[model samples]
Target: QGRPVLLLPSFPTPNGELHLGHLSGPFLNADACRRALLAAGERAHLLLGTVGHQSQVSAAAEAEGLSFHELAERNTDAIIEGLQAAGIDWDVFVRPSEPAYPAMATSVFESLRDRGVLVRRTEPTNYCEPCGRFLLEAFVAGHCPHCGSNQTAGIECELCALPYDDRDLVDPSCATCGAAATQRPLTRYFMPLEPLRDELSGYLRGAAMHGRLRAYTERVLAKTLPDLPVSIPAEHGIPIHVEDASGPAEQRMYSAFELAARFLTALDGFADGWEAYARQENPRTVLFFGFDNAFLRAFAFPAVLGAFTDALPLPEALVCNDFYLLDGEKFSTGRKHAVWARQAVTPANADQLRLYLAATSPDVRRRDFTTRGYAEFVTAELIGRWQRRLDDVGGRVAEHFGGLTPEAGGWHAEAERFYGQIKEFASCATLDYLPGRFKPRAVVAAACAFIRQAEDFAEVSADATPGSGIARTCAALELMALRTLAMAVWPLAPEFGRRVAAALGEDTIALEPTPRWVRPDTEIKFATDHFSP
Candidate 1:
C-alpha cells in the first residue's frame, strides 16, 4: 500500500457529451494528483476507465431512436476525443463491454450470487407506458423522495446527492416522452447491504478519505441501508446470468454489483490480466470521483466488494471533488446547458483553460465556471502578473549576456527557502496526506503563492541591484520559479512547462528523471510573452 498509484473513475453514462464541469471534477483532479506523485519521485500509475454498461444509455437510445450499443459507442468516442484534446494522459482507459472486463463483470455476479450476496427479489420499478420501457434512475423525472424537492433526476436526487427507489419518487414522469410513469411489479436482483452494515461501519470510521467524504459516509450509514437494488430495468448492460430468473423477459439490464466489478476488473488488469501494463513501483491506490457518484463509490461499491473477498483490496485512499458548476448552475449535455469540453478552448488557449481549472477547482466545496471569471483570471493574475515577470527577466538576460544568465550564481536564502517549500509539497503530494490538511489543495495553494512572491522579489532585485551578486541572485530566482512552477503546474497544465523548457533550450523541468534543479549550460533565448497566459 505504499507504492504510488491512482485510479480516476468516471461514469461513461453515454447519455450525452461531457462539459467543462466534468473535466474540472474527476478528470483534471486525477491529472493533478498524478503529476504531483511523479514530481515527488513516485512511479505514478494513472488510469481513466468508462462504464459502458449503464441503463440510462438504453432510455437515451429509445428517446433518440437509436440502438443502445450505437449510443454508447458514439458517446465513448466523443469522450476519448475530449480527453485527448485536453492533453489528459492515461495508462489505461477500460471500457466495460470489452472482453476481459465483461468476463470479470459476469464472474463477479456469478461469485456473489453463489455466495448469496446477490439475491433475486420482487420489487416495484418505474415503468414508462408511453415509451413501453422501464426507466433508470437517470431516466425518471420528479421530486426527491426524501427532500421533497422537484428538481430531481431519476434515482439520483441532484439536490441531495443521494439515490432513492424510483417507486418512491413523487409526481414521477418519463424523462424521455413526458408521459406519466407507474410502479409495476418486477423481479430484480439486489446486493443486500444491511447484513454488512457492521463491516461497512468499521471501514467508514477508519478509512483514509477526505473530510467531506467521511462526513457523507456518516450520512449514508446513519440510516438502516436497504438491500441495494442491483439490476436495472433495461435491455442494455452486463446481463445477470441467473438460472430460473425471469428470462431477461423484462430485458432488465445494468446492475449495482457490476459497478463494483468494474473496479475489481480494473485492479485485476493491474494485478493480473487487466493489461500487461506496469504499476507504481510500490503503491497505494487512490480512487477519484465526483460528488454525485458517492451513492455507489462511497457506500455500496465497497460494501459489495468487501463481501465478495478481502484479497481484491478496497481502495486505501480516495480523492473526491464536490460538484463543479457552470455559470452558477450545473451543466447538462442532455439539456444543452453545457460548454462542451472539446469546444471550450483551442490549442492556443489550452494552458490558459487548464490553469483556470486548477486555480478555481471545487476542492472542498462547490465551484462555478463562468466565462467572465475564466478570462479575468488568465488575463489578469496569470498572464499580467506571472508571465510578464518571466518576459522582463528573459529580455534583460538576452540584452546583457546574449540570452543566457550566468550559471555561476548562488540562490538567495529566501529563494532557496521558497524552493525548499515547493519541494516538500511536491514530495508529500506523491503519497497520502499533506501538511495543514490532505490532498492537492495544499500543494497547489503553496505553488500559486510561491509564484506571486517570486514575482515581487524578481522586480525588486532587478531594480535595486545591477551587475552585482544580488542581480545574479535575482536571475537565479527566476530560474527557480521556472523549474518549480513548471513542476507544480505540470499536472494541471503540462504544455506550459514544455514551452518554458523550450524557451530556455532545456529539458522540460517537469520531465526531469528526478525532480531536482540543475544548472543550464546552453545560452538560451526566452520565448515572447513567455509567461503570457
Candidate 2:
C-alpha cells in the first residue's frame, strides 16, 4: 500500500531518557499508534529526532561550557540509541543539526523577518567582566528580583524560569567567573507573537491540565505579567542599586508585549481549530506532547515544525505539554523516579506500563506516578479484570493455532467490534476528543489495551477448538494494537515503535504519515511489511 505513517520525534534538550511521567502521554501515544497499525496489517514509518536548534544548544552549551554543536550531537545520538532499544521508532530520526535543518530554520526566519515579526534590537545582556565577553542569560547566574530564586542567568531567571530584563535581576553574576556583571547590548531577531496574539490566544484558550502543553501555556499566561522594564536612574553608566532611592521614574519602560499589543491588532490566527501544516505535498496528521521538557520543546518545536512545514504539507499539532511531575516533582533523572522502560518491561509486560499510564494520563490536572500505584493497577485491574480473561483466551488460541499462524478466517462479531473500536479511535486524535495533546496518551493506551485484551480473549476461546476461524483473528488484532502504539508514540518512545512492530513480526515499521491533520473519514488499514532495517 502507500507509505506507513511518519512518526517524528522533536525533543529539544537531550537531558537523557525521557523521564517517567512522560511515558503516559507522548510516548504512549506513539507506541499505541505503532501497535494499532501492526494489528491492522500496516507499516509504521517513524521519523524521529531531536530539535537541537541554535537557541537550545547555544543556551545549554554556554551554561555547561560546551559548544552548541557538540552537546546537541552527543545528546541526540544518545537518546536515539537509548530509545531505539526501548522500542521507539528511530529509522527516520532526524536532527536540526543536519544539512536540511539550517535551511529550514533560515527559511522560517526569513518568512518571519519579511513579515516584520523578526526585529533586531540591541538589548542589554550580562557583561561577563572576567570572561571579557557578553553572556546570554544562561551564562549569567544570580537571584531573581521577584522570586528570590538562585542560579538564574541574565537571559532567564532559573528560579521562576522567566526571561526578564538584565537589569531586573536582583544581583547578576557571571556564570563562568562568579563575579558581578554589567549590561552589554546585543542584537537578535524576534517573532512578533503579540501581533498574532488574538489568533494564538484562541488556540491557547483551553485548559491544559497538568503541565502539558496546554497546561504550560495556561500557567504561563496566568502569571504572565506585562513586561516592566528596569530603569537606570542616572546617566553615569554605572548600574543602579536595587533599592536606589530618589531615582527618576521617567527612565522606566514597558515590555515588548505591551508595545506590540498596543501597536498591532490581532492578525487573526487561522481560527481556534487552525492547524498549521505546510501548503505543499500530500498532507498528513501529527500529534505532539511533553511536560517538563516543555520549555525546551517550546523554544525548539516551532522551529522544528517550521522545518516540517518546509518539507511537508502536514505539520498540524495541538500544543506542547508543560511539565508532568512525578508526585509533585519532576521525574528523578538521577534518583527517586520509577524504573526505566527496560526494567518495567523485564518480562515483556507493556500492559502494566500501558494500563497504569492510561489511568494516570494527566489529560486533566497534574497527576502523580508511583511504583505502588502501578503494581496496584496491574494486579487489581489487569489481572482481576483484563488479564484473567486474556490468559484464558491465549490458552484457547494455542490449542487451536498451536503457535502456528492460522491461514485465514472470517471476522467474528467480537473481532468486528474489536477492530471497529480500533478504527474509531483514529478520530480521537482529531480535535473532537478534546484532543489537545495530553489527552491523546490516555486514548492511545486505553485504545491499544482494548485491542490487545480483545485479541487475547479471542485466542483463548479458540484454544478450546482447533481450526477455530475466530481465534486466527487474534494475531491480527494484536498486531494492530502494536502498530497503533508504535506510530502514535514514536516521538516519545522511539524504541517502543520498533518493539511493537517486532512483536507483530513486521520486517520494518516506517511511519511516514503523521496524524496531525484532521482529514475526513481517515482510512485506517494495514500495510504489508517493514522497510529495510
Candidate 3:
C-alpha cells in the first residue's frame, strides 16, 4: 500500500525578490522530509505554492512598479529554480495566486463574511505619509527609551527592550518616507481571537498527533492563546495590546465609551463567525504564504478556520519556522546580505548544510549560519561519525550474510525489544506535534549493535561465511529504508525521507499518502513487571 504524505510551504509574497531566509527555514525543511518518505516506501509529495496577498507585499510591489501577480510570479520562479539547485526536490510547487487559491479563499471568505465574522471598519491608524498608507508595526519607527535602540518600531523596540505605547512613539518616522509619522486612521479585517485561543494552544504544544498533523497543531497553538504560544508571534517578554479600535484620527477622538461600544458590538459578531470558521473542513487543505507569516500560525492560515464549522477543521497544517539568520544577521537581499539556495546546494557543501540544518534547525528559536559551524559539522559529524557509522553497518552486514532481509526473515527476542521501542516511539510521536526523530537513533543503534555482534567474532570474519542469522542480518539493512524514512521525515531539510526512499530504490514518493498509523489501542492499562534481561 502506498503511504500518503504532503509537505507545504506557505510562500512569502513576491514583493520585489525573495531572500535566503525563505529557502533555509521552510523550503529545505519540507523538501528533506518529502525525500525521506519516498525512499522508505511511503508516498509523499509537497503541495503546490501560494502567492501571499498581504498588505505589505501589495504595498511593496506597488512601490517597485510591479503588480502583485507579476511580482509573485517572478519571485515564485526565482525560489523554484534556486530551490532545485539547492537540492530541494519537490513534486509540485503550487502557487496560490493561481485560480485555485483565490477561488478557494473567496469561497471561504464568503462563508466567513456571511457568518457575520467579516470585520470591515475604518478606524484611526498610524499612517505613514511617505508610504501613502496605514502602518503596521514594521512600518513605524520608535525607540525603547529603556534600551535606547533607535531602530525600534513605534509599537515594539528591537534594541533596548520596551513595548512602545502608540502615544509614546518618540519622534516616529514613516516606513515608506523618512518623514515623521503620525496617527492616521484606516480600516481592515481582523479575526477575533478570544474563541480559538484554547484550541490554538493545544495544537502548538504538541499535545497530540504526529508527523504533519502534529506540526500543524503545534503551529496553531503557538500562534494563538494568552502567551501567544504560536510560532509566528513569539514576541519577546511584553504585554499584549488587545484593543480593536479603528478609523480617521478624528473618529478616534470620539468618546472612549463610543469606541468601546463599537468594539464590543463588533466583537460578538466576529466571535460567532470565527467559531463557524474554526469548524469548516474540505477535501483538500488550503495553505497561505507570506514573509510575515510563521509569526502567527493561525493568523496566516485564516482559511484553516474558515473551512470548518464547530469543525475547527484547520488545514492539515500550516508550518511557520523561525528566521534563518545568515552571517549572524537576518538575510536581506536588499543589502546584498543573503545566501542563495544555490550556495547551500553546491556539491562542495550541500550535504554539510543539510546536516548542519538538521542538527540546529531552529524549531523554536532563531538560528544563524556561520563558517565555524559549517566546518565542525561537515568534518567532525558528517564525515567522521554519521557517515562512518553507516559504512560500518553496511560492511559488516554484507560480510556476514550474502544478501537477505533481517526482520523479514524472522523476529527474535532482542528484535522484539527494538520493535517495542519503535512502537513506543511512534506513540511519543503521536501524542505531540513533532516527529519522533529520536526513534531512528534508537533503531540505528540497535541495527549497528546487531551487526557488530555477528562481525565481532574472529572465525566469522576469517571464514567469510555468516553465522546462523546471516540472511536475517542482511534483511535489517534492506529494511533500513522504511524505518529510516519515518524517523528522518521531520526537521532534516525534507530530503531525509526521499533519501531513505532512494536507498530502498524508489524513483519518487509523490503519490504517497498518510497511513492509518497503527498505535496501541489502550494506553497499556496494566504494567507487566518492567522486564529487563
Candidate 4:
C-alpha cells in the first residue's frame, strides 16, 4: 500500500464567520480533493485547524463585548456550521484553545531552538502605549508602503503581495485604539530564512504548484529573504521565555509559527505521527491555501521544516486559488462586503452553490460572484437542464417499465457506443481530473457535457418502439449513464449524488468506474429540485 496522503487547508481565524469567498477557495477545494482521493481508493485525510492566537481574535472579542474565549467559541461554531452546510468534510479539526495544542506548540519551539534554527533578534516594532501592547497583525493598520493600498494590515500587504515591517507602514494607527503608534525595540526569536534560500529553491523546483504560485516564488527567491519572527510579545498565545542581556523575557510564540506547529499536532494520530511519516522515503503531503499565502506555505514553512529536521521534506504539491471576488471587489470581512456562507447555503441550495463554485473556481484566475449570475446558473442550468434531464430519464423508466428498472435486452450499436463513452468519461472525471490534477472545474464541466449528451441520446431513443429490444437496450444504457453521473458528482455535490443513488436503490455511492445494474423492481424516483429561481 502507498503512504497515506495528508491534505491541509489554510487555517481560518475565528474572528469572523466564513463567507462565500472562503467556501469557493481552500475549504471547498480541499474537501473535494479528499473525496476524490477516497473514491479512487486512496488513503487520504483532510485536516483543518482554527487560528485562535491571532491578535484579531482579541480585538474582535472586545468589539463584540465578549471575552476572548467566548468570541472564539462563538465564531468557531459559526465557521463549522458554514462548512457543514456547504458539504465540506474533514478528518481532524484542531483548536489552539484546546489543552493539547499549547503543548504541541511548545514541543515544536523547543525542537527548533535545540536545532539552532531559531535565533534571538531585537528589532523595531509598532507599540501602542495606550493599550500597552505591541501592535501585531490585525491590531495595526496603515497604508502599504509598496502598493499604497489604504488601511492594509501591519506585516503584509494583501494588494502587492509584499511583506514589510510594522514600522515601515505609512500613517500607522492602532486598530484596537484610535491612536497613533510609535516604534519601539522588542527582543524576540526569529527564523533565519535567508540562510535556507538555496534549500527552499531546490524544494520548490520539484514540487507541483500552480503557475501563479511558481511565478511568485521565483520573484521572491530573486530577492533576499527576510528573517521571520517566530515569537511575539502578547498575552493571548503560547508563552515562552527568552534570555536577554539582564534577565529572562516572556513572550508568546508567533501565531503563524503556532499554526505550523498545530499542523504537525493534527497528524499525531495519523499512522504513528508526523515524525514517522517524515521518516518515510517519500512522504505524501499536499497543501491548499490562497494565493496570498504563497510566501508562507510555499517558502517560509518549508524552510522551517527543513531546518527542524532533514527527515521532514517539503509538501509534494501545493494547490492554491486566487481571490474570489464579490461584485468585482474583493470580499472584505471587516467591511461586511460578502455573502455569508451560513446564511446562503441550505439543504435546498447547497448543491447548486457547490456546482456553481466548482464551475467557476479561481484556480487559474480570480472569478467574481454576482447574485444575478448565481441565480441564473442555478435556475437555468443546474435545475432547468441537469435536474430536468434526470427527471426525464426517471419518468421514462417509470412509464415504460411499470415504475421499475427494465431488464437489458439485445444491445443496439449506438447503445453500446454510448456505454463505452460513459465509462471513459467517468474515469476521466473521477480519477484523472480530480485526483491526478486537482481540477474540480474540469470534472464539473465534463459532467454537464455528459448529461447533455445523454439527453440527446434519449431523444434519439424515443423513436424506438415501446417494449422493443432497442427500447430496452437504450433504457439500460441511460440507466448506466445515470449511475456514472452519480459517481462523478459525489465529490462535488454529495447530497445530490446521494439522492440519485438512493433513487436507484443504492445504500451507498459506489466508487468504481464501471456502472452497476439497477436491481430488479427498484422504483427510480428523482423528485428533488436542487435549486429554484
Candidate 5:
C-alpha cells in the first residue's frame, strides 16, 4: 500500500461517552478511509487524540465533582474502548493535557510570537462570582441569539448550531450551577487573524478547486475569515503563560490558537514510513470531522496552522458530515436522552450496527434514530430478510448436494446479475466510497433488492422436486449473492463480512479486492451460521 501522508483528526473532546450518532461522522468515515488505504497498499498515519484541556470538559467535571484530568481519562477510556471493540484501527492516540503535547503546544505559541502574530489586550469577559473564576463560553448559559434556546453551549447554541456572543445571551448564568454571572474586564493574549486573510483564503480556495472540499464550506471560509476569534481567556484550559498569570501550573498552557497548530505539526510520527511516498511531491493530507465542527476543523485550524508553516503541505480535504438526531432532537447526555455506543452494539453485532449507521448517516442531511427504528431495522431488515436468505439456501444445498458447488450450466444468468452488482459496488468502493459519502441510502436499497431477488429464487425453486435443476440453480445463486454482498460491503461493514465468510467456511479478515479489480468464483461448502453475542 503506497500513498501520501494523510492527517485525519478524529473525536478530540472527551466530554461524554459517544453514541452511535457520533460514530456516523469522523470515526466511522476515518475507519472506512483507513481500511480503503491499507487495502490499496497505502500507508496511513492518523493524528488521533483526546482534547483534555478544553473548558467544556472542565465545567462538566466540576458539575460531576471530578477533576478535569480524572473525568477526561474516564471519558477517553470509554471512547477508546468503544472504537477499539468495534475494530477501528488507528496509528496513535494521545492526550493533549499530557506529554509531548504540552511542549508541542508551547512551540506553536513561540512560533506565532516570533512571527509577531500575537497581540495582548484587555477585554471584558463573563465572570462567575460564586464559582470564583472567569467563565469561558462553555461555562455560561442563556437564551441563544438565534434560537432563543437556553441549552446553549457558550458561543454556539447546540440546539440550533448557531454562534452568538456571550453579551447577546439573555438571562445569562453560570452553566454549571445556574448562578448569576457578570461581565468583568480581563487582560488576555490574542492571535490576530485579520492580517492573514488573503493567505488563508488562498489556501481554502486551492482545496476547493481540487474537489477535496465542497462549495458550502468554501463559501463559509471566504465570509468569516476576518471576524473569527483566535483565543479566549480560560483559567482551566491551556493558558497565557506569558505574563501576569495568577493560576496553577496546570493552567499555564496556551489555548486553541496554539493547540490547533500543535495538532498539525505533531505529524512527525507520520514521517517514518510515509516520507517515501511524500517524496514524490504529492501531499495526501485529509481531515475527518463532523459537519458540526467544520468552522474550526476547516477554517480556524488551517488559518492558524498555515500562518506558522510554509514547508508543510496544507490540508487537502475536509471529509465532514451532518448531525445524527435521536428521535427528533440531538443526543443530549445531560438530559439522559441518548444511547451510549458500547451499550448499543456488542462485539457480536458490531458490524451490523456499523452498516446501519453508515447507511443512515446524516452526511448531507439530518438522520434520526430511535429505539423502535433500531429494533425493527436490525432484526427485520438485517437478520430477518438477508440472514434468512443465507440460511435458507445453505440448508437446502447441504441437504441435497452435500455442500458442493452446483453445476454451472444452470448458474450463468444469476451469476451475471450478481457479478454486475459486485462490479458496480466495487467501483463505488474506490476512493473510500468518496462518491457515495452520502449515498449509502442507495447502497443499502440496492443490497436489499438483491436479498429479495435471492429469496424469491429460493422460494420458487424449493416448491419443485428435489435434485432438480431449478432447485440447484436457486442454491447456486444463493451462495453467489452472499459472497457478492459481503465483498461489496466489506469496507463499510468489515466484521459483518467476516461473520458471513465464517458461515460459508471461509474465515479470513484479509478481504478480497473489489469485483472491479478481481472477481473470483469460489465454492460454498459450509452451513450458514447466523450467530450473535
Candidate 6:
C-alpha cells in the first residue's frame, strides 16, 4: 500500500460563524481532495481544528455580551454543524483549550529551547493600557507595512500574505478600544530565520507549490529574514514556564508556532502514531489554506517543524486558494458583509452549492460570489441541463428494459468510440484531483462536457427500434457514461454521487475508469431533484 496521506487545513478562529468565503477556500478544497484520494483507494485523512486562543474570540465575546469560553463553545458547535451540512469529514479535530494542547505546546517549545535554536529579543511591542492587554493578533490593527493595506492585523497582512512584527505596522492602534497604542520594551523568544535560510530554501525548492506561492517565497527569501516570535509575555493565552538568565519566567506560546507544534503532537494519537507514519520514506502530507496564510503554511510552520524534529521535515505539497470575494470586495466578518455558511448550505441545496463552488473555485485567482450568479448556475446548468438529462436516461431504461440495466452487446464502431471518450475523460479527471495538480474547476468542467455529449449520443439513437443493436449499444454506453460521472463527481458532490452509484447497483463510489457489467435485474433509477433549486 502507498504511504498514508494527511490533509491539514488552516485552523479557523471561532470568533464568528463560518461564511461561504471560508468554505470556498481551505474547507471545501480539503474535503474534496480527501474524497478524491479515498476513491483512488488511498489512505487519506483530514485533520481539522480551531485556533481557540485567538484574541478575536475575546473581542467578539465582549461585543456579544458573553464570556470568552461561552462564545468559543457556541461558535465551535456552529462551525461543526456547518461543516457537516457541507459534507466535510475529518479524522481528528483539536482545540487549543484542551488540556493536552498546552502540554504538547510546552514540550515542543522546550525541544527548540534545548536545541539552542530559540533566541531572546527585547523589542517595542504594542500594549493597550485601557484594555490592560498586550495588543497581539486580532487585538491590534494597522496598515500593512509591506502592502499598505489598511486594517491589517498585527502579526500578518491578509492582502500581501506576509508576516511582520507589530512594531513594523504604520499608524497602529488598539482594535479593542480604538485607543492609540503605546510601545513598551517586551522580552520574547524568537526563531531567527537567518540560520535556516539555506534549509528553508531547499525545502521550498523541493516541495510542490503553485507559481504564485513560489513567487511569494522568493520575494521573502530575497531580503534579509527577520526573527519570528515564538513566545510572548504571560499576559494572555496558555502560559509556559521558561528559565531565563535572571531566573524562571513564564510566557505564552505564540499561537502561530504553538498551533504548528500542537498539530505535530496531535498526529501521535492517530493509528500507529506519528512516529510510525513518519518512518515511511515518502509519506504524503498536504497542507491546504488560503493564500493569506501562504507565509505561515509554506514557510514559518515548516521552519518550526524542522527545528523540532526531522521525523516530518516538510509537507509534500501546499494546496492554496485565493480569497473568495463577496461582490467585488473581500468578505468581512467584522463588517458583516458575508453569506453565512449555515445559511447557504442545506440538505436541499448542499449538492448544488458544492458543485457551484467547485466549478468556481478560486484556485489560481480571486473569484467573487454573488447571489444572482449562484442561483443562475444552480437553476440553469445543474438543474435545468444535468438533471433533465439524468431523468431522460432513467425514463428510457424503465420504458425499454423494465427499469433494469441492459447488458451491453458487442460494441459497433460509434459505440466503441463513445466508450473510449468516456474513459479518456475519466483518466484526465483522476489526474486533476491529485495533491499537487488539484484543478477542481477543470474536473467539474470535463464532467459537464461529457454529460452533454452523452445526451447528444442518446438523442441520435432514439429513432432506432427498441431491441435493435444501435438502441441497445446506445443504452449501455449512456449507463457507462453516468457511472463515469458518478466517480468523477464523487469528490465534489458526495450525496449526488451516492445516489448515482446506488441507482447503478454499486455499493460505493470508486475511481476505477474501466467499464463494469451491471448486475442482472439491477433496478435503474436516477435522481433528478437531488440538486433542486
Question: Over the stretch 1-533, how does candidate 2's per-residue lDDT look in tens digits?
Answer: 44344433334345445555555556555555555454345555444556423233455566678776667777777655545434554334455354443333344434444655444444665676567755544556777775787745343543344444456777777766878887665444334333443444453353232343554555455543322222222111112122223323222111111111110111001111112222322333344455433433333233323422344423344434334556566554434464454344432455456545656766544667777777776665545544343344334334444533344356766666656555555444332223224354555455446545555545544442445655555554543544554544443333445544454455455433222111112222222222111
TM-scores for all predictions: 0.86, 0.56, 0.58, 0.90, 0.82, 0.93
| Candidate 4 residue-wise lDDT, 329-425, digit = tens | 8777878899999999987788888888988888878899999998988877888788888888888888888778777778777787788789877
- For the record, the alpha-carbon RMSD of candidate 2 to the native fold, in angstroms, is 11.1
Question: Which ranges in model 4 have alpha carbons more than 4 Å from their true place?
Answer: 128-133, 164-173, 176-181, 245-248, 269-283, 309-313, 407-413, 431-436, 465-468, 512-523, 528-533
Worst 10 residues of 1 by lDDT: 429-438
Winner by lDDT between candidate 4 and candidate 3: 4
Candidate 1 clash pair list: 3-282, 3-283, 4-283, 137-154, 137-155, 269-274, 387-531
Looking at model 6, residue 238 earns an lDDT score of: 70
TM-score of 5: 0.82
Worst 10 residues of 5 by lDDT: 513-522
Could you list the CA RMSD of all candidates, in the order they appear?
A: 3.8, 11.1, 12.0, 3.0, 4.5, 2.5
Which segments of model 1 are wrong by more than 4 Å? 1-4, 126-136, 150-154, 176-181, 241-253, 267-283, 399-402, 407-445, 463-467, 502-524, 529-533
Please provide, for model 1 over 139-228, each residue's C-alpha lDDT reduced to its tens digit, 9 standing for 90 to 100: 778888778887666666656666666577888888778888876767777777878888888876766777887887787777767677
- Select the stronger candidate by lDDT from 4 and 6: 6
Which residue ranges in model 2 land beyond 4 Å of their true spot? 1-9, 15-17, 33-46, 51-71, 95-97, 142-173, 176-181, 202-282, 285-287, 292-315, 319-328, 332-351, 383-385, 393-533
Return the top candidate by lDDT: 6
Query: Arrange candidates by TM-score, highest first: which order?
Result: 6, 4, 1, 5, 3, 2
Local error of candidate 5 at 121, Å?
3.4
Candidate 5 C-alpha lDDT tens digits along 373-407: 76677788887877777777766766777767565
Best by TM-score: 6
Tens-digit lDDT string for candidate 6 (195-272)? 999999999899988898889889888877777877765335777554452222677777777756656655765543
Clashes of each: 7, 91, 65, 0, 6, 0
| TM-score: the better of candidates 2 and 3 | 3
Candidate 3 per-residue lDDT over residues 1-533, each given as its tens digit = 33244444554445434455666566655665455455455556565443434344454566778875676677777766676666766554545344333333344434554676444444455666655655554456656554566654443443322222344556667765777776665544443444755555544443222344344444434433221111111111111222343442221111111111121122223333323432342122323222234323343233234322433334455444556678788676545677666555564455446556655655444678776886776665445544444445444444544322333344455444544444443343332222223222233233334333423322222433245453353335224423433343333433443454444444344322222121112111111111111
